[PDB]
Design a protein around this ligand. Sequence first.
Ligand SMILES: Nc1nc2c(ncn2[C@@H]2O[C@H](COP(=O)(O)OP(=O)(O)NP(=O)(O)O)[C@@H](O)[C@H]2O)c(=O)[nH]1
Ligand SMILES: [Mg+2]
Length: 168
Amino acid sequence: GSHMTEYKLVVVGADGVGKSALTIQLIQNHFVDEYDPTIEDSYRKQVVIDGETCLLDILDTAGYSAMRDQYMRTGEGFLCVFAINNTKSFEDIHHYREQIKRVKDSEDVPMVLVGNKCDLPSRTVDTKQAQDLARSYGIPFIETSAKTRQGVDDAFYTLVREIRKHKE
Ligand SMILES: Nc1nc2c(ncn2[C@@H]2O[C@H](COP(=O)(O)OP(=O)(O)NP(=O)(O)O)[C@@H](O)[C@H]2O)c(=O)[nH]1
Ligand SMILES: [Mg+2]
């Protein structure tokens, strides 16, 4: 074990749900207020998760996909993000999950369902409803806010834990 483990994480979900804001909060502890649409960006951070020192490589995606399928197939695990005030983004999750399964050609891909913007009033997606969908996929569910930092570390770390379960 002179080899440091590297985990390739990919963040997916509809446009505007907070994929970039989550990632930038994780890396630089900074909340981005401005909406700046992403094409494809990558980040890297060394962290300790359950006592294991590892390197996270994080691919932040856009919310015409020969190129997209390829960079998706590099991913070991996926954060599937929706915003709790955007019903359509929640409905889109099924489609992200199918896209992941298709490109990985696997029915068992490490994944975490993230409900973001939980600092905002007037949620349209209830906790129970998201919890139940996660249950039907057999994956964890976490409520997050890129603005307050609620759930940020826990979302990425939980996904690493799912990857470790997968590797056995
Ligand atoms: N209140 C609040 N606003 C958020 C949160 N997360 C993101 N936002 C806001 O939502 C907007 C879009 O966030 P951004 O991270 O760019 O979304 P994205 O999913 O990366 N968009 P794209 O798919 O185009 O790249 C920004 O104005 C940002 O400040 C959150 O947890 N709470
Ligand atoms: Mg973005």
